[PDB]
Write an enzyme that holds these catalytic residues in place. Sequence first.
Site, PDB file in Angstrom:
ATOM      1  CE  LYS A  76      42.211  31.079  46.656  1.00 56.27           C
ATOM      2  NZ  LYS A  76      42.319  31.991  45.473  1.00 56.27           N
TER       3      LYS A  76
HETATM    4  O1  LIG Z   1      42.630  34.748  47.705  1.00 54.60           O
HETATM    5  C1  LIG Z   1      41.692  35.318  46.893  1.00 54.60           C
HETATM    6  O2  LIG Z   1      42.048  35.783  45.826  1.00 54.60           O
HETATM    7  C2  LIG Z   1      40.246  35.372  47.319  1.00 54.60           C
HETATM    8  C3  LIG Z   1      39.960  34.832  48.546  1.00 54.60           C
HETATM    9  C4  LIG Z   1      38.575  34.862  49.009  1.00 54.60           C
HETATM   10  O3  LIG Z   1      38.288  34.380  50.088  1.00 54.60           O
HETATM   11  N1  LIG Z   1      37.625  35.426  48.217  1.00 54.60           N
HETATM   12  C5  LIG Z   1      37.909  35.953  47.008  1.00 54.60           C
HETATM   13  O4  LIG Z   1      36.996  36.443  46.342  1.00 54.60           O
HETATM   14  N2  LIG Z   1      39.188  35.945  46.512  1.00 54.60           N
HETATM   15  C6  LIG Z   1      39.482  36.543  45.104  1.00 54.60           C
HETATM   16  O5  LIG Z   1      38.582  37.597  44.690  1.00 54.60           O
HETATM   17  C7  LIG Z   1      38.724  37.654  43.235  1.00 54.60           C
HETATM   18  C8  LIG Z   1      37.506  38.261  42.575  1.00 54.60           C
HETATM   19  O6  LIG Z   1      37.375  39.608  42.969  1.00 54.60           O
HETATM   20  P1  LIG Z   1      35.898  40.098  42.567  1.00 54.60           P
HETATM   21  O7  LIG Z   1      35.701  40.054  41.071  1.00 54.60           O
HETATM   22  O8  LIG Z   1      35.741  41.630  43.080  1.00 54.60           O
HETATM   23  O9  LIG Z   1      34.817  39.122  43.313  1.00 54.60           O
HETATM   24  C9  LIG Z   1      38.850  36.208  42.775  1.00 54.60           C
HETATM   25  O10 LIG Z   1      39.706  36.164  41.632  1.00 54.60           O
HETATM   26  C10 LIG Z   1      39.346  35.448  43.996  1.00 54.60           C
HETATM   27  O11 LIG Z   1      40.593  34.824  43.695  1.00 54.60           O
END
Ligand SMILES: O=C(O)c1cc(=O)[nH]c(=O)n1[C@@H]1O[C@H](COP(=O)(O)O)[C@@H](O)[C@H]1O
Lengths: 315, 318
Positions: free
Chosen positions: B138
């Site tokens: 980002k």
């Molecule tokens: O742009 C992103 O990666 C992102 C945006 C957002 O609003 N929310 C979000 O959780 N993410 C990504 O989601 C990833 C984690 O996936 P989970 O482990 O399933 O929560 C993180 O590494 C964040 O970078």
Amino acid sequence: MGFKVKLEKRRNAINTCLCIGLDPDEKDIENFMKNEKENNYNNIKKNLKEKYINNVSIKKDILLKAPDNIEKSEEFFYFFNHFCFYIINETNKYALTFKMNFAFYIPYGSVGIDVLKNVFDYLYELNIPTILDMKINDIGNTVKNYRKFIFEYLKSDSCTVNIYMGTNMLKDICYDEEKNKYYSAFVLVKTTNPDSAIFQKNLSLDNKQAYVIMAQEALNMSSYLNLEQNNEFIGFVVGANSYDEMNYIRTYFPNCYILSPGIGAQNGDLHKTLTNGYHKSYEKILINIGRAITKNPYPQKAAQMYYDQINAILK
Amino acid sequence: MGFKVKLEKRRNAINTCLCIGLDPDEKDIENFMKNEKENNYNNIKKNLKEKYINNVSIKKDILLKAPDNIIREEKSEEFFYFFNHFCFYIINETNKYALTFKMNFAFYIPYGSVGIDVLKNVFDYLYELNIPTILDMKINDIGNTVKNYRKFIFEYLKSDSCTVNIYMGTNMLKDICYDEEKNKYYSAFVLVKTTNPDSAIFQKNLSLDNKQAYVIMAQEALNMSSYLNLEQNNEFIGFVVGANSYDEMNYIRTYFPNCYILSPGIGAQNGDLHKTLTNGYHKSYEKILINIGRAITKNPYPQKAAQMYYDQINAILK
Ligand SMILES: O=C(O)c1cc(=O)[nH]c(=O)n1[C@@H]1O[C@H](COP(=O)(O)O)[C@@H](O)[C@H]1O
Ligand SMILES: O=C(O)c1cc(=O)[nH]c(=O)n1[C@@H]1O[C@H](COP(=O)(O)O)[C@@H](O)[C@H]1O
């Protein structure tokens, strides 16, 4: 140690609220080499005499190894690193703080991070306040890695942040529960690019512009977590060109910390409600000049010039 | 080449819009290191047999080397070793169910340059595997500074796309998605609506012409994707629309037909695409990417968890 106080002592020790920007690009590096190799490595030699060049902890065995290549795999690493050591050794005496933009230390790979660490290691042995401008943003879980990398690994004093994704970021960036410790941050309020804010301005809530909601939100976050004492704070990134807005934040948020870039290159007017709009005990209004100093044929001089004309506080 | 096209092919090849997330943290590393080492390197010897591990460009001599810098012959290379292997491990174990893999930069920098070496290897590995990729870093900065991120991301890592925070301005996209001196085009996802809770003080409570910020920003995102003729070139500027924002989702999908959407948030932050998530934002599924990360990479049986989410996404997807 705390920022507020580390930034207070150094202010006296040298006055001036200048923040030298150290954003070496690909050409800064080849030029410094191109005409250093063909001059008997005089500047690198001057560096190698320094002394404080020993906290530096990455490939110390290569960094302090008298001017030579073979052009070895470490050629580039060398010079890039030294170019930074060079600027610092000749400009720090005029700087209240040094600001490094992470962006320029990552395009070539890990080699550039090694240098970033050595630079922050260096500025750290001299007791020069640092700012890692990386304007981070992410979810609490993830952001925790930026807080570690920044304040634990580089031992930086502060860093810039983009809280558009949500202002709770700061609680994970400015505060580390596991070990207490509080850190300082600079939120992006009004940035220095031309199409700048069709967001920080064209947007608004009840007719109070976005950079005000954001500026206000950021401050109410440093209230919780109580940075202010603990000797840290959360400040704003307000461009040099944004004259109108600069004067407004300084009035509604009068004891606030400001980091303002855009002067010297990016076009600029030192004077004019910039160092005036935003005035206060100067260290609360850091002026950043990078290229104007770092790209000038023989810096320090440039530095000195800024020091002096910045020292023109008819207040 | 072309992201849209590269995304298009693989899709028909595995029928699924599942985007796996590989955000390795410390505990995933040491636990990996202890398990493996407890039950004598089962997965590492496995990695050491995978075809593309021989094409890694960084410390190839170290990753290939009978079970670990073990601590007795290097130590200092240990962390690098197990970290990188844990990733190869996850890709080898779960790649067959992935339409795309997305690495969040934040997890690769906390330990200095060693994590970047691992990141580079991970990206070289997927690239040889030819699996769509996303670097979730980002980014955001004044142009000509942003070019550096452009180089790191699309030159060094050779990633197909990255995520972008356009808040400081939309022109920033001109320098992230277009090289203009090698005449090249690149894809990107800009943050529109995120999975934060207080994720709305700015994204919602803010407006311009009756519209909430997140909508205008999507509009500014697009107008900009039109200016740079990137789509005519098979690239694009999509959106990051969190999984727990159903309305916003349907909204975007509805008024922005044919828009690539990246959506994180299923399991870890709650939710479940099972429902509205993938129904809202439907289309020929690349358009809608469901990122599942920590639910797989932290699960005891990853190839298993990845699967589950596969069939689940296959079902709901009809
Ligand atoms: O742009 C992103 O990666 C992102 C945006 C957002 O609003 N929310 C979000 O959780 N993410 C990504 O989601 C990833 C984690 O996936 P989970 O482990 O399933 O929560 C993180 O590494 C964040 O970078
Ligand atoms: O560092 C910042 O927060 C910043 C904010 C902004 O709105 N505009 C802006 O140019 N900057 C910084 O300005 C630095 C360059 O300073 P100059 O070399 O004098 O243009 C870059 O490294 C940017 O990170």
